[PDB]
């Protein structure tokens, strides 16, 4: 690190966005940065655990894990059926 990351997920208008951010191993934690995403209103609070888990995955081996796609707890029943293709009820973390 530092690691240049992108969180890709739909906003409240269902528009796809790429959120760019740095993660510095030794200084930042997956839980801490996930909480930052939530406090910024970029990620739903229900998604803390899954986003933290996937952030940890991508940061520990950024050489292996170029991309991780994961379910959103917030999207499990929310009016649109989850679709990983389409990143509906899913998000994706990737190396820039």
């Amino acid at each position: 690190g530092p690691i240049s990351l992108v969180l890709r997920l739909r906003n409240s208008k269902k528009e796809l966005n790429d959120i760019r951010f740095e993660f510095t191993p030794g200084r930042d934690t997956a839980e801490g940065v996930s909480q930052e995403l939530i406090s910024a209103g970029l990620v739903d609070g229900r998604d803390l655990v899954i986003v933290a888990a996937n952030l940890q995955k991508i940061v520990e081996e950024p050489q292996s894990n170029r991309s991780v796609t994961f379910k959103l707890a917030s999207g499990v029943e929310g009016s649109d059926i989850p679709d990983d293709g389409k990143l509906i009820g899913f998000a994706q973390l990737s190396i820039s």
Partner: peptide
């Protein structure tokens, strides 16, 4: 400051 959408 962390994030750029």
């Amino acid at each position: 400051g962390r994030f750029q959408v």
